Structures are given as structure tokens and as C-alpha cells.
Symmetry: C4
Subunit: 504 residues, 4 copies
């Protein structure tokens, strides 16, 4: 199963991968490139690499949690199981270190050159810290000593603490994979940021708890320390840890001290350090929280902000209360508490998508109308692209009689009434259009039109209409025919239209 291994090493065709590299052909090229170095090089966005990093993360986390505690509260640090654990952990880290040379880096296109690009760049960047972390230094030191004890013991713990420098690597890994996870699952940034901070914060607290206890151990439990004053040196490890952790935590969240304020200088300085660390962390957390909160209601906030401008405008012109109310109502009907700019979004989209959206919007209208179903779909598409959405309140004159008409209408939803001299009352339903005659006749509006209820209309401008009809002269005839009947019903004969019909 070498082929399988090879496949694993190369980048898979994931959704994220596709997004990164565009087409699938492009992905293949990357794979081919990878193939140059055999049974050695690993691509940064590979599946195997992901798995490896996952493996690392758990282990790393454990080490960060467990190691300090082990160093501090357990004096028997040369016992079997512990030793076994340590060596094994070190091995994994060593392996990881080795892998980083095989692993490709990303800066432009990813650096796939094995001996030159990856090795020489990594050796001058992060290799120094990593190497120290990977190797078991304390054990080496012990071996050296082998080939007066208290001092040695004291020294060893500090040396062992070098194994905690793996945190940097962990951080790096998190930063890498989190970016990848944004391009997969569409994560909210703020949430992610807060979670990381929380993880960091807790870790720091833990370290402080360990650290505070540790200094006394290192300093041989002097009587003016906090451990000796409470008389909990001979108490169980767990209790001590808890107390230490509590002490650390208080400083972090700005509560208080331990049993008493620190007496000895060493203790005092440690406390101060913790406070400095803690307070800053807390501040950062607060900031993060604020950011998160702002993000969460950003959609709602924005709308309100936009509306505020409208209010200000009104104030500037000193409009009557009634008028203001009307405007407010209109706004409510139009946007329904949702900020967006159709002009921008539609522009951003491509043609087919736009068509799809438009069709969905006006599907009902299309179904209703007799002209739209029979004619070619291309014509329909042409028509619906040029439409512009409008909302009218009840008691608004949509068209006034005698004016110069720039735009016709299409009733998607609601009921509008027609008013003409000696025409009684005529009411229009959904899937009806009005204002077609003034654009055809090139004259004035034959009669007034006023909305009965709230009317949701799709307007079409004159120029657009003309453009549409230059492409499809057969559809104009139908329109003309429709107009003529309406005119007859009304009682106002348009002569030009009649002439045109005769000609036809």
C-alpha cells in the first residue's frame, strides 16, 4: 500500500482545495509538482498533514497541561511510568520536527523545492526553538552528570521547563488550520478569536498556578512564603495545586490575594508578574467580547444606523409629523427591517444568477400574465431583467391623468384602482399591468391610477421598454391590441395606435 501513501501525501480534491486552486485540472498540476520528490515531500494542504497536525494538537495540549504540574507537585520525577510518558512524548515531537523539512511552506505559490526552499528557510526561521523543545534535555543532563544532589535536582526542573516551549508551535499550527477552516465551513471570525483567547487564558492561568507553587519548591519552602504560612507543604498534591491555581486565577480576574498579602520579596514579585499578565489578558478578553458583540448584531445595527440618517434628513427639512409617519411606514413596508442595496448585490452577481433570481421574484407574475407564458422565454428574460421594484401605500396616486409618463407598471401583489372621467370604478388584481398606453402612444396619461391597499409593483422605464421591443417587434403588436380594447372600454380613441393597427 505505497500508492495509497503517495495519494495521502498529495493534496486531495476537497471543497476547500477547489476554492484555493480554482479548477480540478489545477489541483492535478499541484499533485504532479508534488510527485517530483518521491516518498519524502508533503504538501501543506494535504490530508495526511491535516491528520498529523490533529495528532500533534491533542498531544501538545496534554503536554502543556501535564508537564508543569508534573515538574512542580511530584518530587518523584524519575519513576517508571512518568519516564515512559516523557520519552514517548519527546519521540513524537522529534518526528514532527523531522516532518517540517518534508512539509512544504506557503508564502504566492507554495514552496515545493525539497533540499533548498523548505530546509534552508525553516532552518533560519523557527528551527531553534523547536529543536530545544523536542529533545529531552533534563535526561541528557542527568546522563552527563552520571558519566550535592539537591542543587542538581533544582537545576533539572528548570531545564525540563524547556519542553513547554512547544506552545509556540501549537499556536502556529492553530493559526494555519484556522485559516483553512475559514475557507471550509464559513466560521464567524469573532467567535473563533474569542475561543482561542479563552484557551490561551486558561493555559496561562494554569501555568501561573504551577509557577507560583514552583518558586517555593525551587527556593526550598522558605518560612515567609505563602505555602509555609498556610502550613500546607505536607498536604496532598491536588489540594496544593487547587490552592495555587485559585491564587493564580484571582490575580487574572482581579479579585484578591491568597490568605494574606505576600511577605517575602520573591513571592511578592511573582504576584506582581501574575497581576501584570492577568490584567492584560482580562483586558484583551474584554476587547474580544466587545468585538464579538458588535459582530453579532451588525446586521440589525446597520439598518438602524441607516434609518437614523433618514430621520436626520427629515429633521433638517422640518417635515410635518404626519409626513414623517408616512415615510416611516413606507420604509417599513419596503425593506422590512433589512439593510441591503440591490444595485450593488445584483452588479456583483453574474447574468445567469441574476436571471434566476429575477425569475423567482416574478414567477408568480409570469404565471398570472397571458402574454408572458405564450411568448418566447428569451423575451420574458429580457423583460424581467429591466424591471425595477417599487412599493406604494394606500391613497397614493401612482399615475395622475394628463402627465408625461416615463414608466409602465406590473402588479405583483396588492390592489390598485383606476380613475377616469365618467369611467365609474375599475380595480386591478395581481398579474395585471398598467401604464402601457403612454409609452406606446408617446403622448399623455389617459386616466389616473390610485392604490387601494398596499401595492407591490414592478416598474419598467420607457427607454428600457423601447430597447426590449426593438429586439421583439411581434410582442409589441399584442401590447397594442391589449391597449386598443382598454381604450374602447374607456371611451378615449387614440388615433396613432389605430393607424398602426390598420397598417399591420
Amino acid at each position: 500500500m505505497q500508492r495509497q501513501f503517495t495519494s495521502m501525501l498529495q493534496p486531495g480534491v476537497n471543497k476547500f482545495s477547489l476554492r484555493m486552486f480554482g479548477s480540478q485540472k489545477a489541483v492535478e498540476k499541484e499533485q504532479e509538482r508534488v510527485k517530483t520528490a518521491g516518498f519524502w515531500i508533503i504538501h501543506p494542504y494535504s490530508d495526511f498533514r491535516f491528520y498529523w497536525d490533529l495528532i500533534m494538537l491533542i498531544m501538545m495540549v496534554g503536554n502543556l497541561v501535564i508537564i508543569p504540574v508534573g515538574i512542580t507537585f511530584f518530587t518523584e520525577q524519575t519513576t517508571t511510568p512518568w519516564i515512559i510518558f516523557n520519552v514517548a512524548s519527546d519521540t513524537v515531537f522529534l518526528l514532527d520536527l523531522i516532518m517540517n523539512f518534508r512539509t512544504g511552506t506557503v508564502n504566492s505559490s507554495e514552496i515545493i523545492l525539497d533540499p533548498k526552499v523548505i530546509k534552508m528557510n525553516y532552518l533560519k526561521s523557527w528551527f531553534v526553538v523547536d529543536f530545544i523543545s523536542s529533545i529531552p534535555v533534563d535526561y541528557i543532563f542527568l546522563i552527563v552528570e552520571k558519566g550535592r544532589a539537591l542543587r542538581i535536582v533544582r537545576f533539572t526542573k528548570i531545564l525540563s521547563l524547556l519542553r513547554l516551549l512547544r506552545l509556540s508551535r501549537l499556536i502556529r499550527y492553530i493559526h494555519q488550520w484556522e485559516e483553512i477552516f475559514h475557507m471550509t465551513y464559513d466560521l464567524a471570525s469573532a467567535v473563533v478569536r474569542i475561543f482561542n483567547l479563552i484557551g490561551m487564558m486558561l493555559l496561562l492561568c494554569h501555568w501561573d498556578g504551577c509557577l507560583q507553587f514552583l518558586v517555593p519548591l525551587l527556593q526550598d519552602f522558605p518560612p515567609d512564603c505563602w505555602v509555609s504560612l498556610n502550613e500546607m507543604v505536607n498536604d496532598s498534591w491536588g489540594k496544593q495545586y487547587s490552592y495555587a491555581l485559585f491564587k493564580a486565577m484571582s490575580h487574572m480576574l482581579c479579585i484578591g490575594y491568597g490568605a494574606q498579602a505576600p511577605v517575602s520579596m520573591s513571592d511578592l514579585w511573582i504576584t506582581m508578574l501574575s497581576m501584570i499578565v492577568g490584567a492584560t489578558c482580562y483586558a484583551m478578553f474584554v476587547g474580544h467580547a466587545t468585538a464579538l458583540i458588535q459582530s453579532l448584531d451588525s446586521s440589525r445595527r446597520q439598518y438602524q444606523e441607516k434609518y437614523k440618517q433618514v430621520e436626520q434628513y427629515m429633521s433638517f427639512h422640518k417635515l410635518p409629523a404626519d409626513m414623517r409617519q408616512k415615510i416611516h411606514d413606507y420604509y417599513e413596508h419596503r425593506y422590512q427591517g433589512k439593510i441591503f442595496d440591490e444595485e450593488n448585490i445584483l452588479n456583483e452577481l453574474n447574468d445567469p444568477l441574476r436571471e434566476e433570481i429575477v425569475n423567482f421574484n416574478c414567477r408568480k407574475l409570469v404565471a398570472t400574465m397571458p402574454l408572458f407564458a405564450n411568448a418566447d422565454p428569451n423575451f420574458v428574460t429580457a423583460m424581467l431583467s429591466k424591471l425595477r421594484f417599487e412599493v406604494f401605500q394606500p391613497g397614493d396616486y401612482i399615475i395622475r391623468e394628463g402627465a408625461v409618463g416615463k414608466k409602465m407598471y406590473f402588479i405583483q401583489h396588492g390592489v390598485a384602482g383606476v380613475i377616469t372621467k365618467s369611467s365609474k370604478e375599475m380595480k386591478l388584481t395581481d398579474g395585471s399591468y398598467f401604464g402601457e398606453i403612454c409609452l406606446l402612444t408617446k403622448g399623455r396619461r389617459t386616466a389616473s391610477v390610485r392604490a387601494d391597499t398596499y401595492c407591490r409593483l414592478y416598474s419598467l422605464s420607457v427607454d428600457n421598454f423601447n430597447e426590449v421591443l426593438e429586439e421583439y417587434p411581434m410582442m409589441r403588436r399584442a401590447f397594442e391590441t391589449v391597449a386598443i380594447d382598454r381604450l374602447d372600454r374607456i371611451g378615449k380613441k387614440n388615433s396613432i395606435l389605430l393607424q398602426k393597427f390598420q397598417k399591420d
Copy 2:
């Protein structure tokens, strides 16, 4: 009164409802849809549902407040009145649970399918938690036991604590109804968010207060606990609660500990937990406050921000101080400390509304002018739509003599003076227009015009004017006539105009 009940079950025609569903016809359709399931199904936006939720909220709140306290500070938990209270409360919750199957869900259109849509979705979503909360588990356990006591008693309290899981339901309800309340009364989001948080925070504090006391009770008041060290075990319930609450509250708001720092591990851990809960809550509160504050002065802030850009621009070109001052003055006059973009807002509005606004703005002007009152209102409307607002400072040449004039003017407010060679001094008042001759003659400006005080003018561009006058050729004649007299007064005869008049 079954009809009434049915009506209640169906959605009413509220303002919010109208907003949601658009037209009233649409609302009727929803009602009809609801009617399919008889004496069973309840619509989410129904009036009855609202009332039910209101009923729940009070009760729920009471339970959240009262239950924990009861569990903790009252050992006599099997007494009559308490028992009566508990059972009754449980009944209501059970009823509510039953209702959720009858209640429709909102995701698109609301799911009105009774046996399939509502029941199967809710059973796999929130039913598990709810059911546990509703049932009186402790009593059931007791019954089971009936069909050594201390342990049982200890167990029972924890079981009873399951009744506090109703909080989730409460939260859900709040989230639902708050959305509805945004679409009714136009609430500020930030305020709402803060209030909810406050409610939550207080509740949490209360729980902590209860919780802290509770552990000692559960653990049988060990001598190293905070209750036994203060010697307030046998003190009255209320005092204990207060002290406990105080302790909780301090941790929340980051003040301090109780009488002393916790000695026993159990206490210590509890304290730590509280601190973790408390600190985070505080941070969240701070964030919310920040958000609120930003929202409150957002209208003011924005203006300032906008102005800052202007200042920066000036700095970039390194303008003289005098010039800068002038610009500042202009800005002050123009916007009056109010950020808004007329171009956007007007576009957003529909035609009738625009007309109304324009009319209100220029009502005074219309009243003043002799031409506007006599002519058709359509013409007036056409004119006023195309107008563009402008502000001039005293000592600014509005028109310079001999230039090519692109726009005429209309004095809404202020006083402007005309300057011509051997024309002495002429001053114009509100409701007067100037700059009409260059657009009619299609030549140069006959004389200069300079503002006396601050002038608020409505400009009309040449193209727009032409457009207006192609529709109404009768109004042009009047303009021409007006011009001729003015020309005569001046002493500069325009020949083309004269010719036109002769022709007429």
C-alpha cells in the same frame, strides 16, 4: 363561544402582522390555511399564543427565582403550601409542553402541518430537555421509594434542580417575542440586548448565591466550609441567603471573597467556578455597554467622522486659514450638524412621497411666485422634482457677467443683489428667480449676481429646464415675457427673444 376561540387561535390583523404578510388578503389566506386543523393547531404569530407566552414568562421567572431558594434554605420541603405550589407549577409546564405540538414553527413559510411537520421536528429538537423540566421528578422518586433517609433527602434536592432547566425555554421565548417586538414598536437593539443580559446576569448571581450555600447543605455543613466558620448555620434563612448572595455577587463584579479565603477544597472550587462565570459575564456586560454607547451617539459621531475627511482633504492641499474658515462656515450652514445624503434617500423613496416632500420644501416658494400658482399643478410638480438645493455665503458671486450659464436659480430664502454696468443696485427677495435669460437666449449672462446675506437657493439645470418646457410650451411664453421686461429695465435688448415674441 367556540367561534371566538377559533378566531383567537387564528392570526389577527395587527400592524406587525400586516408588515409580516404584506396585504390583508394574504393574512386571510394564512387564516384559511390554519383552519385545516380544527380545534387543535395554533399559529406562531397568533394573539392567543402571545398571551400564553406572557403567562409562561411570569411563571417561569417566578420558578427560576423561587425554586432554588426553596431547595436550599428550607429543609421542610414536603409541607403543604409548597407542595401545592410545585404541583400547580408543573401542571402549567406540562400544558405548555402539550401546546408546543399544537403550536406552529417558523423556519420560509411557517410549518402548519400538524401530525408530520410540527410534531416530528419538535420531538427531535427541544422535546428532551422540556419534558424533564415539566415533570415533577422528585415526587415520582419519592413515590417509587415508598412503593437511610438522609441520603434519599440529599438525592432528592439534586433531582428537583432539574426543574431549573426551564430557563432554556424561557430564553427561546424571549428570543422569539423580541424579534416580533422589533417589527412592532421600532426598539433600539442595543438597549434590548443589554436588558436581557442584565436579567440573565442577575439570575446567574442568584443561582450562585443559592449554589454556594447548597453545597454545604449537601455536604452536611463540614467545619472547614464558609457557613460553619462564620457560625451562621442556625441563623434565619433570609440572612443566610443574603450573605450567600453577597458572596456570589462579589465574585461576579470582581470585589473580593467572603469573611476569609476558602479553606476546604469543595468551597474553593465552587468559588473558582463562580469567578469564571462572573468575570466572563462582567466582560460581556461591558461589551454590551460599549455597543449601546456607540449606538447612542452614532448620528453625531458619523457627522464628525465625515467632517474629519474634509479637514484631511484641506490639509492635503494646504489651504489658507481664511479659506478653511469659509469652508467650515459653508458646511455649518449647509448640513447644520446633520449627516445625510439626499441623493440616496430620495432614490430609496417612491415618486408620490418625493413629490410630497418636494412640495413641502418649496411650498413657500410656490406661494410667493406668481407663475406657479396660476399654472397647472402637474407643471409645478415637474418643475420642483428637477430642482437642486444650494446654499451661498454673503459676498459670493452666484453669477458672474459674461460667463456661459448652465443653471438658473430660485430664491427660497435670503437676499441677493444684482450688479450690472450702469444699473445702480437691485435687490431680490424670497420667491424671486434669477438666471432665466441665459437658458432662454442660449447666450451669455447679461449681468452679475452676488448674495447680500446668506442665500438659500434652488437651482435648476439647463437640460432639466429644457425637458420641463418641451412638455409645457405655454409656460415658456410667460417666462419669455418676464425676461423681456427685465431686459428693458436693464437696457440690454436681446433680439432672438424679441423675434420669438413677435412670432408668438
Copy 3:
């Protein structure tokens, strides 16, 4: 001096007033309106009113500071000087109350109707609180009693505390005058908001300090209170106040308790209340600070944000590093770290201002050029309005030979070199223009032009140029002449131009 008084009562012609009311004539109208009610009514924006409010504010502040302290720490509350102070203060407040009926309200235009508008609205709005505050209730109570003592004494202090309800009025006044002060001196909003909060916060702290001491006094110094445990009942007033204030302050800023955690319930509850008040206040302060900070660097922040978008764009297209660097350099040269949009700002301004700005920008250019100084200033104005600012980096081909030229140029600043076949090297200085021939000839570019150093140019488009020259055909001749000489120098004869010259 009744006339003077009358004048004072009426609104003065301040800058703020002018801004509010527009023209000075308008202000006069307001004064006339005011005149309807004689020796009675006061305008809200009057000078006298301002002075009155100033007088109030100091007094009010003093009362807020002094009264609580007096109530608490001085048992001898019936002494002479104190009595004198109190009565006098009350008198002023009573007078202020009376004034509010005379004072006009602002909602639209300000309500100047004396008996109906001002009196009936204020009587149902804020009169209840105010009246109570104004009257000396404690003294009245004492009088009543006159026409067992300890209880009475206890009662009286609480009654006196009603005089602290003037805070509301103070707040109102501050809110009023701060708005006015925005329209005078162009204050930063955030700063103002923070200052108010600080004032409020300190006041609250003071009250808490007083309040904490006060309860013990009211409760007769019970031995389980904080005052009796420290044994500072018989200590001097000042020390007590300080300690009390300290205690209050700690709760506000989240430090700690007093000497010990509160023992008695009353004390405990008070402490809790203070904490609730304090913590919230602190949160608010933090929010305000955040807001202020964001405001302060908003000009800088915005620029950075804008740039970030550019960077993102570059990243999207995956541009070479060199190219990116070039772009960065260009950006630096163009905007100089200053965000602004000329297109918007210029549109916002009126014509004369624009002209002034343009002239200032291109004054140097005008001075340099021989054509601009001799010709009419109108022509110059026309030219300079249509110009568009551009920046070029050294080594950029401004014009390439043989291309179709849409725009000519004007060198404001920097040095550009001309490159033609067998033309050697020609270098242009400030106040020189190039690219004029392609627009005149209506053909192709005669020769290439490349920048030597960083060149700051003003471009003029073809259409604009044509527009300019239709108005002024005499200036075209000069241009033609200039071109011809250049052509001769080059060695490339343009025939059309020659023909035109011949015709001329």
C-alpha cells in the same frame, strides 16, 4: 432700564442663533413673536436664560455636594448659618420653578404661547418632581409638629433628602445647553459624553459615601455596623466622611471592602446596592472611554482600513512583489496617509467655493503659464473647474507614441521628458502643458512622454476641452499657434492644423 431687560429677554444675534434661524431677518421675526407677551415670557435660546441656567448650575452643584454631607455628618442641623443657607437655596429653586412657566419650550418651532402652551405642557411633564425639590419640606414638617424627639429627628433627615431630587433638573439643563454648545464651538462629542459621565460618577460615589454612613445614623449606630466596629463614631466629621467615601469608592472601582466584610444585614444590603451601582457605572465609563478612543484615531484608522482593501485586492490577483511595492509607493505619493474622496467633497460644496479652491490649487500653474494670465478670467475658471488631478512615478510612460489620446496634461510640479524618433532629449518644467496636439488634430500622439522624477499633473479630458473651447474660440487659435511651433521643432508637419491656420 426696562428696554434693556426686554432686549435681554429676547434672543440675541449670536453665531449659534444665526445658525439656528438662518438669516438675521428670521431672528427679528422671532423677537417680534416674543414681544406678544410683555415683561413675562422668556425665549429658550435667550441670553438671559443662559445666564440664569449658569447661575443655577453652580448652585445646584453645591447643593448636591453639600446637602447630603450636612444631613449625615452634622447632627446640629437647626443652627443659624445652615438654616440661612438652606432657605436661601430654596428661594432660588422656587424662583427657577416660576421661571419655567415664563420659559419657552422647544419640540418644530418653539412654543411661545404663554398661558396655554408652556404652562399646561410643563405642568403635566416635570412639575411634580421640581415642586417637591424647591420647597423646604423638613422645615414645614417641623412647623406642623410645633403647631418623642428622636423619631421626629430621624424622619426629618429623610424628608430633607427630597431636596436632592434637583439632580434631574440639573441633568436636563446640561442636556439642553450641551446641544447648544455643539452648535457654537464644534465640540468633540465623545469628550463631552465622558466628562458628563465623570461628573455623574463622582457625584454617585459621594452619595454612596454619605449614604453608607447615613444608614447607621438612622439606625442609631448598631454595634454590628461598620462605624461601631472600627470605633470611629466619636471621631471628627471629616475623617468619618473620608472613610465612608473611601468605602463607597472601592465598591465603585471594584477594589474591596472596608476593614472587614459586612456583618449586619442592613450594612450588607447597602454594600451590595453600592456594588451594583458602582460596577455598572464603571462598565459605562469603560464603554465611553472606548468610544472616545475610537473617535480620536478615526481619521488614521479609516485610511488604514481603506488600504487594507487594496492589499486584499492585490492578494486576490496574486500580483508580483515589485508591482505591489510600486502600487504602495503610488498610494503614498497620492494621498499622503490622508483618506478623503474629492468627488464627494467637491459635489457637496457650491460653485464659488469650488472655484476658489481650484484657483488656490492651480494658482502657481496660472502664474507660470503665458496663455492663462493674458486671457479673460472667466475662461481660466472654465478651464480649471474641468481639470482632474493625477500623480505619476518616475519611469512611467504618461503618453506612448501612436496611441489614441483622450486627455491632455498640465505640469503643476515635477519634471517630465519627451521622447520622439530623432528628437534627442527634451525636458519640461512646472507650468508647462503637453498632450494638446492629439486633441486639436483629432489624430494620434506625435511622440512619447515619460516622467523624469515624480510628476504631479492636472489632466483635462477631450470632451471637457471641446466644451471649454466652444465657449471661447479665440483661445483655440493661441493653442494652435503653440502646437505649430512645437511641430516644426519636432519635424512632423500636421496638415489639418496648417490649413486651419491659413483659413484664420
Copy 4:
């Protein structure tokens, strides 16, 4: 080496300098201006000045750190080394003061007038504070005394504290140079702001630590002070300082008190003051942190915000889930999680840069296409400027057969298939163009085109195409030829094209 000195005094030609002054010629002018005053005046942006300020900053920092400590914890303040240090420090400050008269100020152009502009402005601005700081006042006082001791000693320390007023100058310097450093290295503002605050905060803490100890020293260690209660008067200086610092720091970060709550009034008041200082500082820090955090993820946040609007839009129209998914996919492909507006950025850039960018984008396309490599580069440039980027998803009809075609295409990347009646299957690769025939023929689309995979296309509109081809009629012929072959292959003969070819 006087020439060198002179050079140093004058402004160097740095990058920052260039940015400030534009061209290098301009810089020379500044130098010339500087030359008017000889061996005296120093320019604000000079290199020497920078160095001087750097020198000051270290020294100033040291003084701020060291002086207070010296004043407080060392009673032997008249010893040799200390004296030597003090005098030397004073000398430097005196020199700096002298320099400020020689140093030019910046307000517009920098004030280079030596006796009038720089001296008279600085003498009325900041000279008062500075002078006091510079002079050794304590020593002068001592001298005066020379030409009962305890009181004198007490006095002297306070006088010496005047030397701490150099902080203002330091602040000023920082504010100056930080602005300069923004215009050099493109620093993130937020980071800079936070760092300054941190520096300030620490300094304040230090001062508080010193200050707290100092009052006892001044007050002669009264037994009710915090130093005497802990019995650490005779302890070493360092320990005392640490304890004092700790005490200060706790108040700053809101932890607690020292050993006990303050007993004496003096101590108490000091503590309160510290708390006031501390809390405010902490709040400010929090605000700064928040600002920083918002800045850091602003690029990411913005994108998310933008997307939210899209989501809202979708919600408003109530689109199907499938459709929504499609839209999401499109968005992901198009922008790749990166907010930017090409329309704005490109407008902001100049022509050459745009050309460069466009060329880089379409270099591959150019390489691919046979027509583009052979023809003139000018033509290519013309073509590529007018192109518009578009993205298509697999299964989208790019062109539908029979429609009126407004735009042709260019396949940068991906694979698109052509569909015609009885044409089998034809597939196009990168560097191929389609949609050219409808623009040439001025008719309808000959056949449909649908994307196979994700297609990245560059569209060219009809009008733009026409514009391009009016300039280059030779390139049209090639296009026609290409079309004809394609038509032949298809089987649909276009007659007009054929006619044109014949004519040619």
C-alpha cells in the same frame, strides 16, 4: 568639519522627507531657506534633530525612572555620585531648552524665522514648564540657605520633584516622532497607541509606588501609616520599594489593598487618589485593547458584514435553499473571502499602473491567443483596459441561442462547451474567445454556450468593442476571418460578413 555640521543641520533626502516635500527640488528649496540663519537654526525634520531627540528620550526616561526613587528611598541625597549625576542631567536638559529656540516649529509651512517666529511663539507656549524642569532648583535653594534642618530637608525633596515635569516634553517628543514614523514605516496605529499607553501606565504605577512611600517620609513615619504598621521602616530600600510598588500596582489593576485597609487619613486619601488614577488608566487600556482587536480582524470582519447583507437580501425575497446555496458558492468562487471593490481601486490608480495590473492579470491570456501576440501592443492595451472580470459555475448557460448579445467573452481559465443544433459537442480551453459573431454580425447568437467546470472569463461589452475597433480597423478583419471559419464549421452562413469579406 563645519560643512558636515551644516549638512546635518539641514534636512536630508530621506524617503519620509521626499513624501513630505514631494520632489527633490522642493527639498533643496527648504535647505536653501534653512541656510538664511547660519550655524544657529535647526529644521524640525532634520537628521541631527532626530538624533538629539533620541538622545533626550533615553535620558528623560532614566530620569523619570530614577529621580523619584532617589528622592524617596535614599536619605543620603547630598552624596558625590548622585550629585554628579543630577548636575549632568540638568546640563543636558538646559542644552535641550536652548536648542528649542534654534529648532523650527511646524503648524502649513514650518516657521524658519529665527528671532521672531520660533522664539516669540515658544516663549508663550511651553517655555515656562520646561525652564523649571531644566534648572536644579533644590541645589539653588540649598545655596540660598547657606548664604532647623529637618524642615529644610522636607522642603527640598518637594522642590526636587519639579524635575519630574520633563514628562510633558517627553510626551511632546513622542507625539512628534510617532507622526514621522507613520510616514516612514507604515505602522499600525492601534499598536502604537497601546504601546504608548503601556509605557505611560507603568510610569504612573512607578510614581504611585514612590509617592505612597514618600508621604510617610515627608510626614516622618507616623505610627498609623502603612510602613510603620508592617514594621519595615528599617528594612532595605529595595524591599520597601517593591512593597510600595506592589501596593500601587494593586490599586491600578483593581486587586486589593496592602496588609490592611488604610487607618490614617493621609494614607487613605493617597490610596483613593491612586485608585482614581489607576481605575481610569485601566479603563483606557481596555478601550485601547478593544480598538486594537477591532483593527486586527477588520479585513475579515468587513467581508462577513458584507455577506450578511447578501443573506438579508435573500431572506427578504424568500429564495429557495438550493438557490441560496448556489449564490453562496458563486460568492466563494468570486471573492475568495476577500472584500474589495475593483471599480474604486482602479479609479484611484493612474493609467500606467492600471495597464500594468491588467497586463499581469491577462498575461496568460495574451500568451495563449494568436491574434494578441502578432498585433501592436497598443491595440492589446486598448483591448485589455476595457475587459470586465466574470465567474461562471458549472451548468450555467453563458450564452443562450437566439438571444440579443451585448458582450463577448475571453476564457482565462476553465472549460466551456458549445451547444448547437446538429453540431455534436465542442469544448473550449484557456486562451479561447467566444461570443464574437453577434457583435460583428449585429444579429442574434448563433448557438448556445454552457460552462463545463468553473469558468473564469473576461467579458467585453459591445460598445467598448466598437470603440476599440474604430481605432484599429485592421484587427477587425482578422476577427471576421476567424468568425467565418467557425461559421463554416457550424454550418450556418452569415451573409453580411461574407459580403464584407468580399469587399475587403
